[PDB]
């Protein structure tokens, strides 16, 4: 079901993993407010003075999910199960995706978002997410709640921060 008794199994019905074939994307966070300027012959310079960046990290969306991470080219392994939160960290001007364990609440998994992220959705209670050169995935009983953070992350990223929506309804 959706609540009370909801299943994450089976891994066998979930789509197989894949090595990251996409070129590793850049993290906007590392720059915050800076761009890769060129030299003499190749000279790209954007600049664009963003006036005062940062307030706090705003949580954007939260859903109960189980976290998979793919080993080399083809194995989904359980690293954590719990609840997920999509966070917009405006001080760093980036976004953070954080998975927090339901049992501990420790939060031991983060993924720092890129500036050109497209979301991968097989959709079978299962989403696939891209890392540095590793593949990570989200597994959940509710695609509805899943679409919400999945859409929000990818949509907001494309719109650029015009939302500080804390929770989905």
From Swiss-Prot:
Top-level taxon: Eukaryota
Record domain WH1: where: 53-160
Signal sequence, start to end: none
Subcellular localization, as worded in the UniProt entry: Cytoplasm, Cytoskeleton; Nucleus; Cytoplasm
Biological function: Regulates actin polymerization by stimulating the actin-nucleating activity of the Arp2/3 complex. Involved in various processes, such as mitosis and cytokinesis, via its role in the regulation of actin polymerization. Together with CDC42, involved in the extension and maintenance of the formation of thin, actin-rich surface projections called filopodia. In addition to its role in the cytoplasm, also plays a role in the nucleus by regulating gene transcription, probably by promoting nuclear actin polymerization.
Subunit comment: Binds actin and the Arp2/3 complex. Interacts with CDC42. Interacts with FCHSD1. Interacts with FCHSD2. Binds to SH3 domains of GRB2. Interacts with the C-terminal SH3 domain of DNMBP. Interacts with SNX9. Interacts with the WW domains of PRPF40A/FBP11. Interacts with PTK2/FAK1. Interacts with PACSIN1, PACSIN2 and PACSIN3. Interacts with NOSTRIN. Binds to TNK2. Interacts with SNX33. Interacts with NONO (via second RRM domain); the interaction is direct. Component of a multiprotein complex with NONO and SFPQ; associates with the complex via direct interaction with NONO.
Protein name: Actin nucleation-promoting factor WASL
């Amino acid at each position: 079901g959706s609540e009370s008794r909801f299943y994450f199994h089976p891994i066998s019905d979930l789509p197989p993993p894949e090595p990251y074939v996409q070129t590793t994307k850049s993290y906007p966070s590392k720059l915050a407010r800076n761009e890769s300027r060129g030299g003499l012959v190749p000279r790209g310079s954007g600049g664009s003075l963003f006036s005062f960046l940062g307030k706090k990290c705003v949580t954007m969306s939260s859903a109960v999910v189980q976290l998979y991470a793919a080993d080399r080219n083809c194995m989904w392994s359980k690293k954590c199960s719990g609840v997920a939160c999509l966070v917009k960290d405006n001080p760093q001007r980036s976004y953070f995706l954080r998975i927090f364990d339901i049992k501990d609440g420790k939060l031991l998994w983060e993924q720092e978002l890129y500036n050109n992220f497209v979301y991968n959705s097989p959709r079978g209670y299962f989403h696939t997410f891209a890392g540095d050169t590793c593949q990570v995935a989200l597994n959940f009983a509710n695609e509805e709640e899943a679409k919400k953070f999945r859409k929000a992350v990818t949509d907001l990223l494309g719109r650029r921060q015009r939302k500080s929506e804390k929770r989905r309804d």
